[PDB]
């Protein structure tokens, strides 16, 4: 980013993200039928789209349970936002997975992220990210956890859901190179999975304890090994004042400017 002009164009843009919110598409494609099927409550989806930005990827972590007596469907009941920052093609979020009390009741279902340009494939950066989570986390089950990619289409939003195949998981554990075309990448690595939106139940948010989630505007304050706690509260928007301290901390001024126009007229209170 240009860090001056580049900030503002996208900033007055993102104030319209809520317009997208009511036009969304969902990939319908061939159902494995032996697979799990994930239901995403619409409210969290709306809010998640609304906090995002149209260039930097933001990501969120999925937490849910399967409804009683129906083990093959996973309701996503919660999204957790952790300290993070994006690129246009990927997202850097820390090594620690969410730990918190409200979360103990549910299982992790993977993660969801915004995708500035729509691609009909799981980006190598993603399969690599996911495998590398999975390597370090037994908590995440290969077969149960997914990557939901939410892409910004014109005036719209459109989303797909992927699972790593074991081929993919091994490639990704192995993979170093984060470029858009790493060696040995294959369409054999991922698999699409069945997902539905729902108005039947409401999902909720988990959000960083002492800060907010969006570190894009401080990259030096973000570290892979950084630790965080959580709370029950909603995410602030991308360009929200808090995510942007450096800019509100731009004041170089001498007080005596106030000497000029010392006619104080007030008369009201």
């Amino acid at each position: 980013f240009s860090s001056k002009t580049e900030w503002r164009v996208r900033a007055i843009s993102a104030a319209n993200l809520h317009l997208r919110t009511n036009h969304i598409y969902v990939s319908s494609d061939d159902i494995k039928e032996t697979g799990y099927t994930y239901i995403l409550p619409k409210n969290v989806l709306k809010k998640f789209i609304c906090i995002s930005d149209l260039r930097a990827q933001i990501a969120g972590y999925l937490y849910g349970v399967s409804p009683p007596d129906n083990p093959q469907v996973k309701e996503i009941r919660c999204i957790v936002m952790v300290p993070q920052w994006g690129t246009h093609q990927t997202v850097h979020l820390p090594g620690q997975l969410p730990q918190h009390e409200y979360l103990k009741e549910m299982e992790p279902l993977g993660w969801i992220h915004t995708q500035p340009n729509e691609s009909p494939q799981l980006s190598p950066q993603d399969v690599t990210t996911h495998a590398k989570i999975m390597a370090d986390n037994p908590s995440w089950d290969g077969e149960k956890t997914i990557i939901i990619t939410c892409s910004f289409t014109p005036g719209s939003c459109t989303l797909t859901a992927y699972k790593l195949t074991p081929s993919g998981y091994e490639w990704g554990r192995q993979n170093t190179d984060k470029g858009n075309n790493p060696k040995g990448y294959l369409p054999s690595h991922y698999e699409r999975v069945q997902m539905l939106l729902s108005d039947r139940f409401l999902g909720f948010f988990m959000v960083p304890a002492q800060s907010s989630w969006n570190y894009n505007f401080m990259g030096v304050r973000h570290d892979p090994n950084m630790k965080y706690e959580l709370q029950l509260a909603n995410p602030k928007e991308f360009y929200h004042e808090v995510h942007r301290p450096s800019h509100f901390l731009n004041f170089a001024l001498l007080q005596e400017g106030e000497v000029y126009s010392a006619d104080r007229e007030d008369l009201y209170a």
Binding site: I12, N16, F204, L253, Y260, A269
Partner: protein, 1525 residues
């Protein structure tokens, strides 16, 4: 006749206060016109003082009354005019008007008018006791207000009376200015503050208002003064309580018109003095310039300045008023460089080289301003901008005459007072950002600055020189000699004025509107000069009173307000209705075009980017435009702003936006035009942004109310949030702040660090302590929440706010304001919000707020409870409330349908003797009764009947009683009600119903065990309250009279829900246990209001579902119309006061001719509200409308009265009922009401239960009440409210019954939900538990832990626990869940009971009562009480100790604390035999100690606390005996 719409545009006066209504002017005597090239110059000489009249002398400060003389020190004699009117000043309440020239010293006249009132309240042994009166001084200018409070303070200080400026934001300083008298303010301030109601707590304590410089009537600001005074007068006509009004004006014609306006009797009240009375005679010079081209003009005026100034260059003094900031010093240095260009001519401003102190001007050398250049020479400059102290240092220099040339601004004339030998006004034109252009300065500005001409002391006569444009030259003559009419600009503002009056409720309809306008200055002007105001004389003759013009006028205002949605007013009725938009508009003094712009523009989804634009579109800014020259700088500013404007290009929107940002971002601007503009924008911005916040918050749209309150704060504080909060403490160094901003270390992480760890971050350790202070000065709340589900739809939230910050009144001041708002799952919708205000006293005291919130069908992961300071920026705390574990209650089955039955005649029961006690009362039983009948009467089984209060369940009980009557001669029946009042109320009926007619003996239980025992068993029907029937019947095993009862009746069982409910629950349960052991069935009949969970109650009390009748509140014999009225004023006094008028209106609307009961929060409030009902009764022009008999008939009743005011209120048909009234007085009032003599009775809330007289309309006023113990208000218990509502029932006659409940904003939704639906009821036994286990263990009903659990299973708690487990903090609905829960329960109850030595627990299994518990159980005393006794009473204790030990008893904490009982009990405690060790006077134990000693000393106290004393004494002996034991 029907009204017609007119155009208010061509009907106003543009360029107001420059108006010049007369087109002809006059010479003075020796005046001449001499025209030069390019400029006409007019000269008038000084006036000739009127020769002293025969035997007319000045008054010294001696010969005027003794008291007032104080504070006049330094002044030996009164001014001629002061001396003229002092008599009427101090000897009459007649209103005043004086017209006297500038310099006559008008203030000291008005001062006397104040010293009279200050004297009206005086005592011998104390002076000027200050809570009787307050005075309001309205002055036109701010500087003038400041300086006036400054000197008034000094002067009046001898009296010790506290006078202050009213700059207060409404809420933080009200309770501050509560203690303030003689408050000074600008008319505007008074108008907003009255529109909000900050005044309505002050008024009626106001006997005097001063209008100073009332000629401001002619200014655009005029309508405000017109609005003030009109309101004051129109109000006095309603209240009949009068006020003095003292007007002060410059000398101008239309004096008699202003007189009419102020209701000044021209005879004794009018005072006029012409321009000859100026203390320093004024020679007037006026030079108008004919030059059209401005380029040549800006030379010509320079040169006129030079010649005029060189004229006085000898021994004399000149003062130049320029209207520019910078040009104060641009005008100087022109004179200087000219004097240098003069070949050193004009110089030597002294008597010599060294003479006249040129070393004075040289030795003062180094100064803050540009003075260093000018000071070595003869002249200098003055203004507010460049310096603070050096202004005072220049004023000192001018007074002592070391500078004979001073160029300055109008704020110098309006500020601290110094004159000049001759003053010169350069140009008269100023820049008006409000008007968007340049305009000639106001009347008061010149009048003030030219009234500075000449000294009172060092001068002979003053001169003044006004350099203006020739075209305006006529105008400025019509002023400074009295030619100018004072006219009203009121028409321009008429739509805005009307709104605010509807908003205050002072105008309901068109008629009240014309009545109001009939009090305006514009009215008398339209009367006496119709030709000017747009009325031809012929149609004036056609309508002499202007009824049809005042009807046409205001009709257009009504239409404008309707079209912008400030008011809903239909032409047919002529009535107005206020909308919240209207209120917001009035409260912020924002125009009605701006507000509709906001209505259409504002949507939930608005970004900051857009919020600013909407702000920029405010109609208040309509004339602001963007100039070519400044579009160069605006672009730079546009790229240096944080919030993108880029939606807009260069147009007014952009200019205003970038300006607001510039101000917040704190940016200095090169152009002067832009500076003034920016100032305008930002000053109006506070009110504007705030009205936005209020609107958008009332809508409930969370995100935008955040963005808008934050904007408000950013405007107030002049910074963005991205800057360190420490900046709001201005006490802090800038470099330190910038330093902590340098390193990014999130602010809330400063609390973890100590004084040293702080300084280590910025490597400035010397600061380490001071920083720390501020970090802990910054307001911080921590908050906890206790949440329990009520119904599947609603949860209850108890928020506990604990102050985490160190209070300093030099920072936080008297009060700190916080919004608490609970937001939904996405932080999208605001489900609920309250305004919470923590006062000074109560920092560190945790406050408890209780409120309900709804839940919805996709049950969400959590809500959020947000709390944010109003004024404080970056100060917020959020609290996730997680539902992850929430278990919602089982949805409630539909109420049993009301069957359609042939209404049962009394002829049903075949018993004639029974028929007799009904037939002559009502012909038919109601559908409820007739549906219950066969089950309750012809059949023997337990029934439950819920129906909402007013359904007639009492005779449903009487059915069962009659059945038992047939069953046996001696048949025994016990009847229970939770309210003792209700019990006596039942007894009075049933004693005649049964004992009188049916010969069957009827009794009513009492305190004493013995007498009570004897009572039952002689009686067939035993009426009692749960506590009386607990103590007796705990021992039931031994008392055969308990066991042998045939029937058992529980009335109002839903009351289980409330406190003193557990005892009810426990006695019904016990009753069942007895029927278990007695082997005979004991029929139980329970009666409740509509109950959602009635099933549980029935299952508990053993009713088959077939005999269970639970009815919906919509089933009532007489239908009810319920209305709820929300009031947004949180401060309870103001709220309670502002619902006064609505009460009257609620009567006139809902029940004009029918009986009306009004319930009130306070014992005393009943009087006051009866009064107010009568005083606003006069308003209607309708007097004594509520009295239905002649005064001759009421005399026999009034002979029995003590209370004198009650006589009055009764005389007009009202009357009241409360604690203090003698039972005869009460009986009388009740009689008068029911008989139909008086139509309205105001009653204390306490009397809702025990009142035997019903009504048609019931109005509940303000559902909160005051509790001294936590020092806060607390809501009416819901069942109470339902009872008050049920008090509107008149089945005999009315086809309907009506209720209006006026309550706070917060409490609105709660009533909307729970008054209509059937009610849920939960058990409280889990909390109040020990006492009963103890007592029961004593009877050996619980022999061991097992028996304890078993006992638990007989309760209603047992029933409910699995129904709504989250309420009882039971975490699962399972079997072992409930089992483990009850287990843990008896476990800890028995443990706590064993710790207290009331029982002994053997083997861990068995239990036995011990000494303590035995005592407790015997005397029916709380167990903690006698434990306290156990650790308190020692070997050496005596009556001194026994008093306090018996006082701390638990049964004495039921004793409450009333409004300001902290001083009362202190005054009593002073004079009692035994003093106390640092007693807190809000504590009921202390109060009972003091009341007890008072009783021992036979001191007669007020009946208020005497009642209390009696109640203490009632239960005293038992406690005493327990101590003996």
């Amino acid at each position: 006749a029907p009204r017609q719409v007119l155009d208010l545009e061509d009907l106003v006066f543009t360029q107001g206060s420059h108006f010049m209504a007369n087109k002809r002017c006059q010479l003075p005597d020796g005046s001449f016109r001499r025209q030069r090239k390019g400029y006409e110059e007019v000269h008038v000489p000084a006036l000739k003082p009127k020769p002293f009249g025969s035997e007319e002398q000045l008054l010294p400060v001696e010969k005027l009354p003794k008291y007032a003389q104080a504070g006049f020190e330094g002044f030996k004699t009164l001014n001629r005019i002061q001396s003229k009117l002092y008599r009427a000043a101090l000897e009459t309440d007649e209103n005043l008007l004086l017209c006297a020239p500038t310099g006559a010293g008008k203030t000291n006249v008005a001062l006397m008018c104040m010293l009279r009132e200050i004297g009206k309240h005086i005592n011998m042994d104390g002076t000027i006791n200050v809570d009787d009166f307050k005075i309001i001084y309205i002055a036109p200018m701010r500087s003038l207000v400041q300086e006036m409070v400054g000197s008034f303070g000094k002067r009046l200080a001898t009296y010790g009376i506290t006078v202050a400026e009213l700059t207060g934001d409404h809420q933080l300083c009200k309770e501050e200015i509560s203690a303030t008298q003689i408050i000074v303010c600008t008319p505007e301030k008074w108008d907003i503050i009255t529109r909000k109601g900050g005044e309505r707590t002050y008024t009626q304590l106001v006997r005097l208002i001063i209008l100073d410089e009332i000629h401001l009537l002619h200014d655009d600001r005029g309508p405000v003064l017109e609005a003030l005074v009109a309101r004051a007068i129109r109000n006095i006509e309603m209240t009949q309580e009068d006020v003095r009004l003292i007007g002060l004006s410059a000398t101008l014609p239309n004096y008699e018109d202003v007189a009419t306006f102020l209701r000044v009797d021209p005879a004794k009240g009018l005072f006029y003095f012409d321009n000859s009375f100026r203390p320093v005679p004024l020679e007037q010079t006026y030079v108008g310039i004919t030059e059209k081209k401005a380029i040549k003009r800006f030379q010509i005026m320079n040169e006129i300045v030079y010649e005029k100034i060189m004229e006085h260059a000898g021994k004399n003094q000149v003062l130049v008023f320029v209207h520019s900031r910078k040009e104060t010093g641009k005008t100087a240095r022109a004179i200087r460089d000219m004097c240098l260009e003069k070949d050193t001519l004009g110089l030597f401003l002294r008597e010599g080289s060294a003479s006249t102190e040129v070393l004075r001007t040289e030795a003062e050398q180094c100064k803050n301003l540009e003075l260093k250049d000018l000071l070595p020479y003869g002249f200098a400059i003055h203004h507010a901008g460049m310096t603070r102290v050096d202004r005072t240092l220049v004023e000192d220099l001018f007074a002592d005459k070391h500078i004979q040339v001073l160029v300055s601004t109008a704020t110098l004339a309006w500020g601290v007072n110094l004159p000049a030998h001759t003053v010169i006004i350069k140009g008269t034109q100023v820049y008006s950002p409000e008007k968007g252009r340049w305009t000639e300065l106001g009347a008061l500005d010149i009048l003030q600055m030219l009234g500075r001409a000449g000294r009172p002391q060092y001068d002979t006569k003053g001169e003044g020189i006004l350099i203006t444009s020739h075209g305006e030259l006529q105008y400025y003559l019509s002023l400074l000699n009295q030619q100018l009419p004072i006219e009203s600009q009121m028409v321009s503002k008429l739509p805005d004025m009307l709104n605010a009056e509807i908003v205050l409720g002072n105008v309901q309809n068109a008629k009240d509107a014309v009545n109001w306008l009939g009090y305006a200055y514009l009215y008398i002007r339209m009367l006496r000069s119709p030709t000017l105001y747009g009325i031809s004389h012929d149609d004036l003759k056609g309508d002499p009173l202007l009824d049809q013009r005042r009807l046409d006028l205001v009709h257009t205002a009504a239409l404008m307000l309707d079209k912008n949605n400030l008011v809903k007013y239909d032409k047919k009725t002529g009535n107005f209705q206020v909308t919240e938009l209207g209120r917001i508009a009035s409260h912020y003094y924002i125009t009605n075009d701006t507000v509709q712009t906001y209505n259409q523009l504002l949507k939930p989804t608005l970004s900051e980017i857009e919020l600013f634009r909407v702000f920029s579109l405010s109609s208040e800014f309509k004339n602001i435009t963007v100039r070519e020259e400044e579009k160069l700088e605006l672009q730079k500013l546009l790229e240096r702003v944080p919030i993108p404007v880029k939606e807009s290009i260069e147009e007014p929107s952009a200019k205003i936006n970038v300006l607001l940002q510039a101000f917040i971002s704190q940016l200095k601007l090169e152009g002067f035009a832009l500076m003034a503009d920016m100032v305008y924008v930002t000053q109006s911005a506070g009110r504007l942004m705030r009205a936005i916040f209020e609107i958008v918050l009332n809508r409930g749209w969370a995100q935008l109310t955040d963005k808008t309150l934050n904007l408000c704060k950013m405007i107030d504080k002049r910074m963005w949030q991205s800057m360190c909060p420490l900046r709001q403490f201005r006490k802090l160094p800038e470099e330190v702040v910038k330093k902590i901003e340098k390193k990014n270390f999130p602010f809330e992480r400063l609390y973890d660090l100590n004084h040293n760890e702080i300084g280590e971050l910025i490597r400035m350790p010397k600061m380490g302590k001071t920083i720390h202070k501020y970090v802990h000065l910054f307001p911080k709340l921590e908050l906890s929440v206790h949440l329990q589900p009520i119904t599947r739809s609603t949860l209850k939230v108890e928020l506990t706010i604990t102050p985490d910050f160190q209070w300093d009144e030099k920072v936080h001041g008297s009060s700190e304001a916080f919004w608490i708002l609970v937001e939904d799952v996405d932080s999208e919708v605001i489900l609920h919000h309250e305004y919470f205000l923590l006062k000074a006293k109560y920092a560190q005291d945790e406050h408890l707020i209780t409120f309900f919130v709804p839940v919805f069908e996709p049950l969400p992961p959590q809500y959020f409870i947000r709390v944010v300071s109003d004024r404080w920026l970056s100060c917020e705390t959020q609290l996730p409330v997680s539902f992850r574990h929430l278990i919602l209650p089982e949805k409630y089955p539909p109420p049993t349908e009301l069957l359609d039955l042939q209404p049962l005649p009394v002829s049903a029961l075949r018993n004639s003797a029974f028929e007799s006690l009904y037939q002559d009362k009502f012909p038919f039983f109601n559908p409820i009764q007739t549906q219950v009948f066969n089950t309750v009467y012809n059949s023997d089984d337990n029934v439950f009947v819920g129906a909402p209060t007013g359904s007639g369940k009492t005779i449903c009980a009487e059915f069962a009683i009659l059945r038992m009557l047939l069953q046996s001669s001696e048949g025994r029946c016990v009847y229970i009600t939770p309210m003792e009042a209700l019990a006596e109320q039942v007894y009075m009926d049933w004693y005649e119903k049964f004992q009188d007619r049916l010969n069957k003996k009827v009794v009513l239980l009492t305190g004493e065990t013995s007498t009570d025992l004897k009572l039952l068993g002689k009686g067939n029907i035993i009426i009692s309250t749960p506590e009386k029937w607990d103590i007796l019947s705990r021992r039931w095993k031994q008392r055969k009279n308990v066991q042998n009862i045939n029937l058992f009746v529980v009335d109002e069982v839903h009351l289980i829900g409330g406190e003193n409910g557990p005892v009810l629950e426990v006695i019904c349960s016990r009753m069942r246990y007895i029927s278990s052991q007695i082997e005979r069935p004991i029929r139980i009949v329970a009666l409740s209001s509509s109950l959602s969970n009635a099933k549980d109650v029935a299952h508990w009390l053993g009713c088959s579902a077939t005999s269970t009748f639970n009815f919906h509140p919509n089933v009532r014999p007489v239908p009810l119309e319920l209305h709820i009225q929300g009031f947004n004023i949180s401060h309870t006094q103001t709220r309670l006061l502002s619902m006064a008028k609505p009460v009257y209106h609620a009567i006139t609307k809902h029940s004009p001719k029918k009986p009306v009961i009004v319930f009130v929060p306070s014992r005393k409030q009943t009087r006051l509200t009866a009064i107010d009902i009568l005083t606003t009764c006069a308003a209607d022009i309708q007097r004594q409308r509520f009295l239905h008999c002649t005064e001759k008939d009421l005399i026999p009743y009034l002979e029995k009265l003590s209370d004198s005011t009650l006589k009055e209120t009764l005389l007009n048909g009202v009357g009241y009922l409360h604690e203090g009234l003698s039972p005869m007085e009460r009986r009388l009032v009740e009689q008068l009401f029911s008989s139909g003599a008086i139509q309205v009775v105001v009653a204390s809330r306490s009397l809702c239960w025990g009142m035997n007289v019903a009504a048609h309309l019931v109005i509940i006023m303000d559902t909160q009440y005051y509790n001294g113990k936590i020092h806060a208000y607390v809501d009416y218990p819901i069942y109470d409210v339902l009872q008050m509502v049920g008090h509107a029932n008149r089945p005999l006659q009315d086809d309907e019954g009506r209720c209006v409940i006026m309550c706070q904003g917060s409490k609105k939704d709660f009533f909307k939900k729970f008054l209509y639906e059937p009610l849920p009821v939960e058990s409280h036994l889990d909390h109040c538990m020990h006492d009963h286990f103890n007592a029961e263990i004593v009877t050996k009903t619980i022999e061991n832990k097992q028996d304890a659990v078993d006992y638990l299973t007989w309760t209603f708690l047992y029933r409910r626990m699995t129904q709504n487990p989250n309420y009882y903090n039971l975490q699962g609905i399972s079997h072992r869940h409930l089992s483990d829960h009850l287990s843990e329960l008896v476990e800890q109850t028995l443990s706590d009971l064993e710790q207290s030595k009331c029982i002994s627990i053997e083997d861990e299994m068995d239990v036995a009562p011990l000494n303590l518990g035995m005592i407790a159980a015997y005397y029916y005393i709380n167990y903690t009480t006698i434990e306290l006794f156990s650790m308190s009473l020692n070997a050496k204790t005596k009556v001194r100790g026994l008093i306090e030990i018996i006082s701390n008893a638990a049964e004495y904490e039921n004793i409450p604390i009333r409004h300001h009982e902290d001083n009362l009990l202190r005054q009593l405690a002073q004079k009692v035999p035994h003093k106390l060790n640092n007693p807190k006077f809000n504590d009921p134990h202390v109060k009972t100690n003091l009341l007890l000693q008072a009783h021992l000393s036979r001191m007669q106290l007020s009946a208020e606390l005497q009642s209390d004393t009696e109640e203490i004494l009632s239960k005293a002996i038992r406690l005493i005996q327990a101590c003996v034991d």
